[PDB]
Amino acid sequence: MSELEKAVVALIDVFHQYSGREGDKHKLKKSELKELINNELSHFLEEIKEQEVVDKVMETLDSDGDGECDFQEFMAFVAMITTACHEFFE
Amino acid sequence: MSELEKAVVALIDVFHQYSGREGDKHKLKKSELKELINNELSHFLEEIKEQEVVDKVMETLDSDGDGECDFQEFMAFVAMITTACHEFFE
Ligand SMILES: [Ca+2]
Ligand SMILES: [Ca+2]
Ligand SMILES: [Ca+2]
Ligand SMILES: [Ca+2]
Numbered sequence: 001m002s003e004l005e006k007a008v009v010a011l012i013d014v015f016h017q018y019s020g021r022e023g024d025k026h027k028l029k030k031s032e033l034k035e036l037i038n039n040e041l042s043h044f045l046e047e048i049k050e051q052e053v054v055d056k057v058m059e060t061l062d063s064d065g066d067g068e069c070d071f072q073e074f075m076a077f078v079a080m081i082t083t084a085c086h087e088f089f090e
Numbered sequence: 091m092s093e094l095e096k097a098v099v100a101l102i103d104v105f106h107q108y109s110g111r112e113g114d115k116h117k118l119k120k121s122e123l124k125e126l127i128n129n130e131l132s133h134f135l136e137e138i139k140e141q142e143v144v145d146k147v148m149e150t151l152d153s154d155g156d157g158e159c160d161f162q163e164f165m166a167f168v169a170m171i172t173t174a175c176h177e178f179f180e
Protein backbone atom coordinates (compact mmCIF):
# COMPACT_ATOMS: atom_id res chain seq x y z
CA MET A 1 0.00 0.00 0.00
CA SER A 2 0.99 3.59 -0.78
CA GLU A 3 1.90 6.33 1.72
CA LEU A 4 -1.62 7.74 1.35
CA GLU A 5 -3.21 4.34 2.12
CA LYS A 6 -0.85 3.87 5.05
CA ALA A 7 -2.01 7.29 6.33
CA VAL A 8 -5.70 6.44 6.01
CA VAL A 9 -5.27 3.26 8.06
CA ALA A 10 -3.04 5.01 10.64
CA LEU A 11 -5.89 7.49 11.24
CA ILE A 12 -8.31 4.62 11.86
CA ASP A 13 -5.81 2.79 14.08
CA VAL A 14 -4.85 5.69 16.38
CA PHE A 15 -8.52 6.51 16.87
CA HIS A 16 -9.34 2.97 18.07
CA GLN A 17 -6.20 2.75 20.19
CA TYR A 18 -7.54 5.62 22.33
CA SER A 19 -11.33 5.40 21.98
CA GLY A 20 -11.41 1.72 23.09
CA ARG A 21 -9.72 2.42 26.43
CA GLU A 22 -12.87 3.26 28.47
CA GLY A 23 -16.61 3.61 28.14
CA ASP A 24 -17.86 3.83 24.60
CA LYS A 25 -15.25 1.77 22.69
CA HIS A 26 -16.00 4.04 19.69
CA LYS A 27 -15.74 7.58 21.10
CA LEU A 28 -12.88 9.48 22.69
CA LYS A 29 -13.83 10.70 26.13
CA LYS A 30 -11.81 13.61 27.53
CA SER A 31 -9.07 11.51 29.15
CA GLU A 32 -8.63 9.44 25.95
CA LEU A 33 -8.55 12.62 23.83
CA LYS A 34 -5.86 14.14 26.14
CA GLU A 35 -3.58 11.09 25.95
CA LEU A 36 -3.99 10.89 22.17
CA ILE A 37 -2.84 14.52 21.91
CA ASN A 38 -0.07 14.16 24.45
CA ASN A 39 1.39 10.93 23.18
CA GLU A 40 0.64 11.20 19.43
CA LEU A 41 0.73 14.91 18.57
CA SER A 42 3.76 15.98 20.63
CA HIS A 43 5.53 17.64 17.60
CA PHE A 44 2.41 19.50 16.38
CA LEU A 45 0.63 20.50 19.63
CA GLU A 46 1.80 21.68 23.11
CA GLU A 47 1.45 19.09 25.83
CA ILE A 48 -1.91 19.33 27.59
CA LYS A 49 -1.46 19.76 31.37
CA GLU A 50 -4.53 21.75 32.55
CA GLN A 51 -8.11 20.45 32.87
CA GLU A 52 -9.28 23.72 31.27
CA VAL A 53 -7.46 22.90 28.09
CA VAL A 54 -8.82 19.32 27.98
CA ASP A 55 -12.34 20.77 28.41
CA LYS A 56 -11.81 23.49 25.84
CA VAL A 57 -10.31 21.21 23.11
CA MET A 58 -13.27 18.82 23.55
CA GLU A 59 -15.71 21.73 23.54
CA THR A 60 -14.16 22.70 20.16
CA LEU A 61 -14.16 19.19 18.52
CA ASP A 62 -17.51 18.08 19.92
CA SER A 63 -19.91 19.17 17.11
CA ASP A 64 -22.89 17.13 18.19
CA GLY A 65 -22.56 18.23 21.82
CA ASP A 66 -22.44 14.73 23.35
CA GLY A 67 -19.30 15.42 25.47
CA GLU A 68 -17.20 12.94 23.44
CA CYS A 69 -15.37 12.94 20.12
CA ASP A 70 -16.57 10.27 17.67
CA PHE A 71 -14.96 9.20 14.44
CA GLN A 72 -16.48 11.98 12.30
CA GLU A 73 -15.43 14.62 14.80
CA PHE A 74 -11.97 13.11 15.01
CA MET A 75 -11.61 13.35 11.18
CA ALA A 76 -12.53 17.07 11.48
CA PHE A 77 -9.71 17.43 14.10
CA VAL A 78 -7.19 15.70 11.83
CA ALA A 79 -8.18 18.08 8.99
CA MET A 80 -7.65 21.11 11.29
CA ILE A 81 -4.20 19.86 12.38
CA THR A 82 -3.26 18.99 8.85
CA THR A 83 -4.40 22.45 7.52
CA ALA A 84 -2.35 24.17 10.30
CA CYS A 85 0.75 22.08 9.48
CA HIS A 86 0.28 22.85 5.79
CA GLU A 87 0.06 26.62 6.24
CA PHE A 88 2.98 26.68 8.71
CA PHE A 89 5.53 25.54 6.11
CA GLU A 90 4.85 27.91 3.25
CA MET B 91 7.28 11.37 15.00
CA SER B 92 4.28 9.14 15.72
CA GLU B 93 2.17 7.21 13.19
CA LEU B 94 -0.45 9.97 13.38
CA GLU B 95 2.15 12.68 12.64
CA LYS B 96 3.57 10.59 9.82
CA ALA B 97 0.02 10.37 8.40
CA VAL B 98 -0.57 14.12 8.60
CA VAL B 99 2.62 14.84 6.66
CA ALA B 100 1.92 12.06 4.12
CA LEU B 101 -1.41 13.77 3.34
CA ILE B 102 0.38 17.06 2.70
CA ASP B 103 3.10 15.36 0.64
CA VAL B 104 0.85 13.33 -1.71
CA PHE B 105 -1.24 16.42 -2.36
CA HIS B 106 1.78 18.46 -3.50
CA GLN B 107 3.22 15.57 -5.48
CA TYR B 108 0.15 15.70 -7.75
CA SER B 109 -1.05 19.31 -7.54
CA GLY B 110 2.37 20.71 -8.55
CA ARG B 111 2.47 18.80 -11.85
CA GLU B 112 0.61 21.36 -14.02
CA GLY B 113 -1.10 24.71 -13.85
CA ASP B 114 -1.90 25.89 -10.37
CA LYS B 115 0.89 24.28 -8.31
CA HIS B 116 -1.61 24.21 -5.40
CA LYS B 117 -4.74 22.62 -6.89
CA LEU B 118 -5.39 19.22 -8.42
CA LYS B 119 -6.74 19.56 -11.92
CA LYS B 120 -8.65 16.57 -13.32
CA SER B 121 -5.62 14.76 -14.78
CA GLU B 122 -3.66 15.20 -11.50
CA LEU B 123 -6.67 14.01 -9.47
CA LYS B 124 -7.00 10.89 -11.72
CA GLU B 125 -3.33 9.90 -11.35
CA LEU B 126 -3.44 10.46 -7.59
CA ILE B 127 -6.40 8.05 -7.38
CA ASN B 128 -4.94 5.55 -9.80
CA ASN B 129 -1.46 5.42 -8.39
CA GLU B 130 -2.12 6.12 -4.69
CA LEU B 131 -5.57 4.69 -3.92
CA SER B 132 -5.37 1.42 -5.88
CA HIS B 133 -6.37 -0.76 -2.84
CA PHE B 134 -9.30 1.48 -1.78
CA LEU B 135 -10.76 2.67 -5.12
CA GLU B 136 -11.29 1.06 -8.59
CA GLU B 137 -8.90 2.28 -11.26
CA ILE B 138 -10.30 5.26 -13.15
CA LYS B 139 -10.39 4.59 -16.92
CA GLU B 140 -13.32 6.67 -18.27
CA GLN B 141 -13.42 10.47 -18.69
CA GLU B 142 -16.95 10.38 -17.22
CA VAL B 143 -15.65 9.08 -13.95
CA VAL B 144 -12.82 11.67 -13.80
CA ASP B 145 -15.46 14.39 -14.41
CA LYS B 146 -17.89 12.96 -11.89
CA VAL B 147 -15.31 12.48 -9.04
CA MET B 148 -14.18 16.11 -9.54
CA GLU B 149 -17.77 17.29 -9.69
CA THR B 150 -18.24 15.58 -6.28
CA LEU B 151 -15.04 16.93 -4.56
CA ASP B 152 -15.19 20.41 -6.05
CA SER B 153 -17.20 22.31 -3.37
CA ASP B 154 -16.36 25.81 -4.51
CA GLY B 155 -17.12 25.00 -8.15
CA ASP B 156 -13.77 26.14 -9.58
CA GLY B 157 -13.17 22.91 -11.60
CA GLU B 158 -10.17 21.93 -9.43
CA CYS B 159 -9.62 20.32 -6.03
CA ASP B 160 -7.68 22.48 -3.57
CA PHE B 161 -6.22 21.47 -0.25
CA GLN B 162 -9.44 21.91 1.76
CA GLU B 163 -11.41 19.90 -0.77
CA PHE B 164 -8.73 17.24 -0.80
CA MET B 165 -8.96 16.91 3.03
CA ALA B 166 -12.74 16.39 2.59
CA PHE B 167 -11.93 13.56 0.08
CA VAL B 168 -9.49 11.92 2.48
CA ALA B 169 -12.18 12.03 5.22
CA MET B 170 -14.70 10.36 2.87
CA ILE B 171 -12.23 7.59 1.94
CA THR B 172 -11.21 7.14 5.53
CA THR B 173 -14.90 6.94 6.73
CA ALA B 174 -15.62 4.33 3.98
CA CYS B 175 -12.57 2.25 4.97
CA HIS B 176 -13.61 2.50 8.62
CA GLU B 177 -17.17 1.29 8.07
CA PHE B 178 -16.05 -1.51 5.71
CA PHE B 179 -14.16 -3.38 8.44
CA GLU B 180 -16.71 -3.55 11.21
CA1 LIG C 1 -13.83 5.63 24.84
CA1 LIG D 1 -19.42 14.42 19.87
CA1 LIG E 1 -2.08 21.47 -10.49
CA1 LIG F 1 -12.50 23.54 -5.98
Ligand SMILES: [Zn+2]
Nearest residue numbers: 016026176180
Ligand atom coordinates in the same frame (compact mmCIF):
# COMPACT_ATOMS: atom_id res chain seq x y z
ZN1 LIG G 1 -14.40 1.73 14.46
Ligand SMILES: [Zn+2]
Nearest residue numbers: 086090106116
Ligand atom coordinates in the same frame (compact mmCIF):
# COMPACT_ATOMS: atom_id res chain seq x y z
ZN1 LIG H 1 0.92 23.72 -0.05
